[PDB]
Design a binder for this molecule. Structure first.
Ligand SMILES: N#Cc1c[nH]c2nc(N)[nH]c(=O)c12
Ligand SMILES: N#Cc1c[nH]c2nc(N)[nH]c(=O)c12
Ligand SMILES: N#Cc1c[nH]c2nc(N)[nH]c(=O)c12
Ligand SMILES: N#Cc1c[nH]c2nc(N)[nH]c(=O)c12
Ligand SMILES: N#Cc1c[nH]c2nc(N)[nH]c(=O)c12
Ligand SMILES: N#Cc1c[nH]c2nc(N)[nH]c(=O)c12
Ligand SMILES: N#Cc1c[nH]c2nc(N)[nH]c(=O)c12
Ligand SMILES: N#Cc1c[nH]c2nc(N)[nH]c(=O)c12
Ligand SMILES: [Ca+2]
Ligand SMILES: [Ca+2]
Ligand SMILES: [Ca+2]
Ligand SMILES: [Ca+2]
Ligand SMILES: [Ca+2]
Ligand SMILES: [Ca+2]
Ligand SMILES: [Ca+2]
Ligand SMILES: [Ca+2]
Ligand SMILES: [Ca+2]
Ligand SMILES: [Ca+2]
Ligand SMILES: [Ca+2]
Ligand SMILES: [Ca+2]
Ligand SMILES: [Ca+2]
Ligand SMILES: [Ca+2]
Ligand SMILES: [Ca+2]
Ligand SMILES: [Ca+2]
Lengths: 145, 145, 145, 145, 145, 139, 145, 145, 145, 139
């Protein structure tokens, strides 16, 4: 039986078997849903989480449990992506991590927050500035269908 | 209800809960529409508004309310896109913001104005320059279908 | 100029120069828009109007003028689509005609009303039955993006 | 505040202003979510409902609230679709109605339950039999990507 | 030096080397342009011409010359497709022939006329009724871009 | 845990709560894999299962395990599809069922096996005759 | 050394291992080229080939070789496609076979000749006739790019 | 009635109400058509014009009429693009402007001429040099389909 | 007989015939499958592999065989992809190589681990670092179907 | 028609009426075909030609014939691209030029040859050095 109340402590990690190398690992999460803060009205999003690990790697079952812990939680989309990133940063202490959320529209408008991070003072911080400044140089076509 | 002539007063905002890191928040607005100043004939576009927030963030519903205010308003597409950015800039005081509108053609011709901005004298101004200089390097294929 | 409340009087037509053979003439109308009866909020759709003419054919510009007349008019999508067909039917007296509208979602739900008609008692009535019975057998994938 | 417990009683309807003709009305519902009856695990699907109205018509907002009521309600997917069709049949007494759920996979296996109904003994009963014998003759490619 | 004044006599044919067999042959003509009758305003279309031949086959250079003969000719789209079909019928006396034109929009609306023919009293006449009644059972998505 | 030996006894059904109407239920199964009839080399397919239930319905997880058990099992194609179809018939005894497997082409050869069943003495048996007839005009 | 004069004597056959069944074997030649018989000018196409064998199968390497023997042969496209089907028919005595060719444009017009066959008297014959009747209902979009 | 003879003098402009910032304005022109100087054969292309405005802005309808003036005007494609850029530079005196033609093939060969310009000695001259050194580093796949 | 216990001793190499050049050789395994080390449960993916050789090349048949030796091996996806790259690195001593894996979802989450390498000290090393920094900027849309 | 023997003498240029500015001109050529270096088997490619003219420009039809002449000609790849590039240099003597050929993979091997030239002693020679550097980070 799962908690639909925000619960960061469900997250787990496992050791990295290839530390001495930089690789990407993406999590496609098309089943994310949470609630709006004022109304309690359900919101929906596909979330892409890509990160380069150091020692600790996020185990996907826990990711799933952590993503399920937002079902009854009423927060804004931009906050949501950012909270998702902070807890993952604290969990793994990764070299680089990015969170890209794509929500379904409300009142004809859809919100896609994009946030990232690079271990401070290193070249991943530089990459994060790079991916950020070159972010969505060509936004994808959307027509709400 | 719904005003249908320019009304930037309807825009509202909320505190940025993650002020200490840069992140993009994009609004896909494919249901936008307004009028042509002289003829009165209507036009339609999809507008992408990406921005890196400082301390204030535009409230979604109010953004919707703001774009409906152009339904009975006559303006050019270029003007229109700059007007939008101005009254987001003034509302939020963002680190960076850009507005890319893609209009449906008249006389077989589509107009896609793109404009952007970064706080004067900060690294966001260099970004605004970068993203503008490298803007639409590979234009997308249009056949008007 | 441009009236923005129901005005079916603006529809015009011209003689069918090829009365002696059946052929479809489709109007892709992706710039359609109107209001919701109670709220006043606006909605958008793409409307496909295919028809087999008899002796009269709707004049394109007037069709445009007719669809602009729904810009400030409150109605439901289903009603709206039937109203359109009625005042094409009455204008042209076609052998067959159908109206398929595809609306942008509200509360996460899109409404695609489809309606059709063939002259009472002719083979076009069998067509109307066929095309309705076999209509949208394989619905298209919608994700609201 | 809402509630996410099965609530068929929240559905509303309005008179069909166009009773004298047959036409289809489809609802694309990509945000459907409910629970597995045992585990308690959330599940997701895209639901397409298409019906031919008699005298009543489901009001989309009521359907919205109705579909949300499944959010914290457990049940297998095949029942789920039947339940949705029954509730609409009682609400509207349609000439015809079909429901096609497309669920996301569990264990790399996805279930797409299709149900339909014709007003008993009328010619729609035969349509239901036709659309069921001819249902999904050429199924879509699914790889779970 | 080519005539841009309607000229059907430019068309040529060659004998069929495989009469005793039914095969399709499609001509994709994305470079078609003509003028509007009232204004002289240029119009544009991609035209697909598919036909099953008998004895005579249309030589493509002549098709090209015939399609170029419309550049200064001011006719309506529906007429245009139909005239294109009649002259091809007279030229070849084919078993079956279809003409599908797709024009670029004017005033936000695009017109796609579809017309066909089967040698009268034969099974191709039946096919023509078939392709007609099953015509565009799923119109393609259009948004004027 | 898991059995990779053919294991039809893993299948499990639950009762159908709606028997007055005919409705389809499709299972998309794109992770099917087994061992080929001779070489011993693996083969892969997406298996599309559609059926009109009668009184019994197949539980998804049970089905998932059932299909895995074919992982280290060796038998020809057509057999492989009917094996499945038949176990599903013996499990549910439905009105109609059809199993279509699309193997990743090994020669220039598709090999997409299509079988179906209609309950004998019924209209479903004519439907099976009907779909099978339409299936091959276009796979 | 190679043969670039039309040479069907190159085709080899082998056993169908699946004589009991009806499976389509598909070949796909993306770079076929011959010559215009009128001038000596080269032409180019993609050739799609599908057939259900009986006893025989064409060994695909001799098919590629066979297709290269057109490099210096003058013939029209319609003729060309039909010739390839005949030579395959004579080599294999297939149950069913079809050849769909897609040529690059010349004079801004591209020719796609489609031809098929089903053993006479069999259901394959009838299978081929259903296919000519429903061949390419929705032609793909071509813009010559 | 129009005329289709080279007419640069038909271009109009309006003051740029937003002089104090840099922004791009692109025109997608898919209906461009003109003539080959010798043969007299029509030719077609999709033209993308993007410019950064200083004090003037081209009026889209004037550009429409301007682009139509090439309809019965002969010229190679590389000149054609230069001519269009020059005429716009004189009209507007832009900070920056680039023009990219994409022509349909002749002899299976298509020419895509790209031209640009920076206000002399200003920093746009350097932008032009940047967008020219970096122009088309990863060219699109073209097969003439 | 086959090997379904992890067996890298299966890989064979051969000569690069193009030692002077830098060409990517691509392999594409659409049906890879292993096992979860946690439970014994099977997992599935498509494996993309690209590498620039030096002296050696992997004989592709032993690559397929090598990939099938994972059928019964327990390991996570990140680990798995990295192992394949290592074994290829040791066999070929490539100039550059990357492995991009795409797993089917489990718990409604799919894992795509991407990893690469460029000979240390060379430009290939730097080539690999540019790629990690610009890897998958726009993630493809995933909806689990 | 037509010559299918290598025939560089078929190339023809016309003067450039705009020499004060640098502009690119690209020729998309997806119907290139020639005979391979050994077997004698044909090979096919789409050839992308981009160049900044100086004073001379290549006439399209002349180019079309030029490329056909490679139809019954035998020579290796890299050679084949430079042959083209060089004849184009000798024809136009442009500021910059690059020829990229994308052959339909014969092994699992692309073979996409990329060459370019910048006029020596100029900034174009640095641009050639620049593009060539960026080309291979992603073909
Ligand atoms: N839930 C919710 C929201 C309601 N208004 C919002 N506005 C913004 N910008 N973001 C949000 O996430 C929401
Ligand atoms: N309405 C209108 C317009 C007419 N000419 C225009 N030209 C430009 N650049 N923009 C516009 O919005 C319009
Ligand atoms: N506006 C509005 C609507 C609110 N409920 C609705 N229900 C239906 N079926 N249609 C509609 O157009 C609307
Ligand atoms: N939830 C859930 C389920 C678990 N097994 C199932 N089996 C079937 N046929 N359907 C279902 O919805 C489920
Ligand atoms: N040209 C032109 C036309 C102007 N109005 C039109 N209306 C229709 N229905 N068709 C047409 O081709 C035209
Ligand atoms: N080559 C060539 C041709 C020149 N005119 C043609 N006309 C047709 N229908 N087909 C062709 O192949 C050719
Ligand atoms: N029209 C025409 C042409 C004929 N040869 C050409 N060569 C070039 N480079 N450009 C052109 O536009 C033409
Ligand atoms: N199998 C398996 C797994 C279970 N949790 C996992 N978490 C991660 N990051 N990767 C994996 O492969 C798995
Ligand atoms: Ca939320
Ligand atoms: Ca969409
Ligand atoms: Ca406007
Ligand atoms: Ca388009
Ligand atoms: Ca309405
Ligand atoms: Ca979509
Ligand atoms: Ca459920
Ligand atoms: Ca898929
Ligand atoms: Ca016309
Ligand atoms: Ca479009
Ligand atoms: Ca030929
Ligand atoms: Ca194309
Ligand atoms: Ca020209
Ligand atoms: Ca193409
Ligand atoms: Ca594994
Ligand atoms: Ca998908």
């Amino acid at each position: 039986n799962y908690l639909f109340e925000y619960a960061p402590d469900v997250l787990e990690s496992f050791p990295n078997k290839h530390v001495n190398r930089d690789y990407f690992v993406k999590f496609n999460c098309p089943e994310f849903t949470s609630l709006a803060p004022k109304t309690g009205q359900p919101d929906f999003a596909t979330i892409y989480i890509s990160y380069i690990p150091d020692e600790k790697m996020v185990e996907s079952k826990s990711l799933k449990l952590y993503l399920f812990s937002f079902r009854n939680h009423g927060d804004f989309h931009e906050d949501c992506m950012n909270i998702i990133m902070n807890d993952l940063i604290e969990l793994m202490d990764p070299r680089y991590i990015e969170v890209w959320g794509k929500f379904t529209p409300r009142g004809g408008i859809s919100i896609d927050p994009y946030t990232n991070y690079g271990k401070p003072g290193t070249k991943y911080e530089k990459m994060a500035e790079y991916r950020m400044m070159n972010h969505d140089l060509y936004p994808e076509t959307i027509d709400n269908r």
